[PDB]
């Protein structure tokens, strides 16, 4: 029967709408294989026909628009949006041509003009159900885009033009059903960067013809949903203006640095033909540039070696930048229009949708405060030589791919993809040449988020992540501090489940504090007692994993003990020297819990170390007492060795003993009382 | 049996009790030191 008969058969209409919902659900969040499969059930012709049709019921109209978006555009839009908050500006001839204003002057149109920030392209593949079957990931199904954008523009223009007729039969049965779907489609197309200068000019013209020229939408009566869509549209142009500001600033920075370097060269050459004037050239470059910019006020214009023209140039640029942000020093700009529209909407009626309220007030706050947004965005800006564009783009692809897997339950394919992507990243030279850039993208935070989400059930994922994090720490001290920040979070996890075969979170925790006096001193004491508490358990109960494998049961698990002791050793001893504060704290905590020392040192009924190690050696002979890849005698002998090494490292230096410090003497006396000398001599022999 | 416990059990129904003075009339009178009375468990209806 004709599908248009569903306007009078309500049960079938409801069932079909829910069927469309199920279709839209089984392909959600980047499941491209199912998206490819669905193309055999709803082909291009059906979708385009449904888009054009005017007699279709509202629910089915909305369902088909959403189905098209979900099948063909969702993944690309998400990927593009994830990278829209960063600005990597390459230094190229077209970059040098960007200016705040066209030849303080009149504002330009938002969204038009050239941009140079890096953004990776989109990838699509054509559907086909006769190709031979053969594990590379699948791309989204393809669909012509220029025709689609032309169709969307035509439909929106028709809707706006016919809105003035106040007819009694709107498409879909209401204004909301007529307007919301096309606005969603146009917003999705716009964010992806499919439109050109002429298309964006047309859109701006049909939003408000009076302001953007060299009856609109805002002047009509609309329900809440259309207003929410308009807010979503305006956010895009606000973001474009911010990006333009950042790019102009970078171009000016390059042009200024050139002249500054030339002038410093000339001045240094002259100087060779008071001695205080020579301090500039024997200081780090950051201090030099800091002092070269200290002339904002005439009172601070004494120590600047500069001339007047350069200062005038910088002052002119600063004044222009302030003018662009709306700071004074029939609306005719985006800011005034947005402010007036938001206030008028607010005072026309009492709005009920909380989402609309949040959107309006966020927009208003962005408009009133101009350069606060610039200040908050500058940290995520960077400049790059043109020779590194290819490597940067390749790195961005992998980073985005990793980011995408933050919203899906882990599976073998995801594990393989992450392993491959990390391997690819670690082989790029940019990962070494620009550590600050990597730290600005927050890759480590993403990696730890993924690691915790699966925290075993995935032993190869944790090993790779831990290795990557350790390598990241080893690059520089700033990375070391960055990872040190999350030390407490890292310690909470992996407290019973070792997954001992491969690197764990404790390993990266240890690597975050190696050979750094400042970080070691800054170490909190709450991280010390928790680790000791973890250790205390290892001295009481055997590992369930070994029991599952049939190993004989004893009342402790040496493996975890040696792991935690290794961490403590790395914490206490740095570059051939012992830090006394942590030594005292850890020895005090240990003595507070005598059970941590192991059965030999338990005291009451506890045999000496020599007897314990002899017993372990004898155990090593019997297969029955050593096993049903791991052996018990070696584990026991390693645990005791690690404990003794830790205690030895905890001892104080001899120069302190000469001063007769009470604490040092108490510590030495305690340690001496703990282990007899003859026991050590017997062990060595 | 009876125990001392802490944690979530402080908000659960298995840690509540009712006071039943021996006299019936004016059983709602203010409690006073040395008064004899019974103790009851609400959920199980057993007496200490």
């Amino acid at each position: 029967m004709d599908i248009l008969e569903l306007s009078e058969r309500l049960d079938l209409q409801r069932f079909h709408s829910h069927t469309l919902r199920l279709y839209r659900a089984v392909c959600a969040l980047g499941n491209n294989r199912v998206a490819h499969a669905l193309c055999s059930h709803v082909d291009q012709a059906q979708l385009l026909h449904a888009l054009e049709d005017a007699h279709l019921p509202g629910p089915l109209r909305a369902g088909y628009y959403d189905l098209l978006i979900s099948i063909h555009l969702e993944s690309a839009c998400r990927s593009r949006r994830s990278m829209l908050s960063e600005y990597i500006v390459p230094l190229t001839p077209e970059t040098r041509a960007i200016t705040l204003f066209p030849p303080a002057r009149r504002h330009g149109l938002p969204g038009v003009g050239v941009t140079t920030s890096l953004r990776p392209p989109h990838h699509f593949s054509p559907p086909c159900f006769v190709a031979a079957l053969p594990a590379p990931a699948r791309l989204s199904p393809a669909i012509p885009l220029e025709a689609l954008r032309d169709k969307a523009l035509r439909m929106l223009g028709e809707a706006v033009r016919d809105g003035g007729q106040h007819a009694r039969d709107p498409v879909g049965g209401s204004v909301e059903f007529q307007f919301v779907p096309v606005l969603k489609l146009v917003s999705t197309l716009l964010v992806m960067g499919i439109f050109g200068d002429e298309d964006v000019k047309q859109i701006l013209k049909m939003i408000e013809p009076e302001v953007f020229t060299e009856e609109g939408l805002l002047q009509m009566k609309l329900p809440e949903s259309v207003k929410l869509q308009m807010c979503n549209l305006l956010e895009y142009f606000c973001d474009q203006e911010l990006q333009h500001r950042v790019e102009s600033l970078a171009a000016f920075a390059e042009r200024y640095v050139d002249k500054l370097q030339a002038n410093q060269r000339s001045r240094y050459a002259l100087l060779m033909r008071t001695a205080r004037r020579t301090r500039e050239f024997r200081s780090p470059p950051q201090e030099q540039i800091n002092m070269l910019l200290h002339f904002k006020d005439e009172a601070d214009e004494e120590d600047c070696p500069l001339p007047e023209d350069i200062r005038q140039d910088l002052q002119d640029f600063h004044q222009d930048l302030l003018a662009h942000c709306g700071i004074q020093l029939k609306p005719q700009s985006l800011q005034e229009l947005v402010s007036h529209m938001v206030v008028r909407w607010a005072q026309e009626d009492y709005v009920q949708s909380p989402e609309l309220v949040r959107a309006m007030f966020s927009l208003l706050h962005r408009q009133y405060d101009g350069l606060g947004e610039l200040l908050r965005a500058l940290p995520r800006a960077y400049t790059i030589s043109p020779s590194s564009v290819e490597d940067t783009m390749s790195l961005l692809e992998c980073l985005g791919q990793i980011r995408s897997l933050l919203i899906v339950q882990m599976g073998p394919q995801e594990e393989n993809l992450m392993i491959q992507s990390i391997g690819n990243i670690m082989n790029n030279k940019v990962f070494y040449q620009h550590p600050n850039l990597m730290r600005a993208l927050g890759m480590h935070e993403t990696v730890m988020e993924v690691m915790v989400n699966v925290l075993i059930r995935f032993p190869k994922m944790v090993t790779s992540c831990c290795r990557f994090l350790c390598y990241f720490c080893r690059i520089s001290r700033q990375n070391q501090r960055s990872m040190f920040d999350h030390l407490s979070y890292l310690l909470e996890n992996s407290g019973i489940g070792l997954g001992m075969q491969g690197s764990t979170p404790l390993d990266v925790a240890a690597a975050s504090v190696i050979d750094n006096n400042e970080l070691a001193l800054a170490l909190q004491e709450q991280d010390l007692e928790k680790v000791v508490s973890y250790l205390a358990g290892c001295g009481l109960q055997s590992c369930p994993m070994l029991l599952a494998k049939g190993y004989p049961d004893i009342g402790w698990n040496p493996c975890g003990g040696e792991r935690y002791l290794d961490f403590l050793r790395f914490a206490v001893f740095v570059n051939g020297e012992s830090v006394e504060e942590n030594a005292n704290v850890v020895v005090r905590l240990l003595i507070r819990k005598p059970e941590c020392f192991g059965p030999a040192l338990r005291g009451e009924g506890g045999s000496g170390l020599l007897a314990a190690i002899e017993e372990a050696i004898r155990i090593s002979e019997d297969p029955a007492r050593d096993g049903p890849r791991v052996h018990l005698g070696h584990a026991i002998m390693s645990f005791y060795a690690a404990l003794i090494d830790l205690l030895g490292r905890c001892a104080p230096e001899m120069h302190l003993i000469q001063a007769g410090k009470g604490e040092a003497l108490r510590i030495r006396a305690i340690l001496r009382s703990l282990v007899p000398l003859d026991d050590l001599v017997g062990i060595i022999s | 049996l009876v125990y001392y416990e802490g944690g979530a059990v402080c908000t659960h129904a298995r840690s509540l009790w009712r006071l039943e003075p021996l006299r019936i009339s004016w059983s709602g009178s203010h409690l006073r030191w040395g008064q004899p009375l019974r103790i009851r468990h609400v959920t199980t209806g057993r007496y200490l």
Partner: protein, 83 residues
Amino acid sequence: MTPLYNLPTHRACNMFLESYKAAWILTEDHSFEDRMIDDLSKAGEKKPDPLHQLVLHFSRTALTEKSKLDEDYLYMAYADIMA
């Protein structure tokens, strides 16, 4: 200790951006809070006016039953403005 005129251009540009932000941007003063509250407190043409609606929205978010209070920057910014 190398001279500033020997570094690669991009590193110098990054340092310049850092210094310019530190010294010239945040030192600027701009007062708008009074004007922003005065504008929001008016009405046209009783239903609440825009400032009342904003306060009511924040109260609604506060009253919702949840285990933890999520941090959102919009509330902090508007609280700072009102203060």
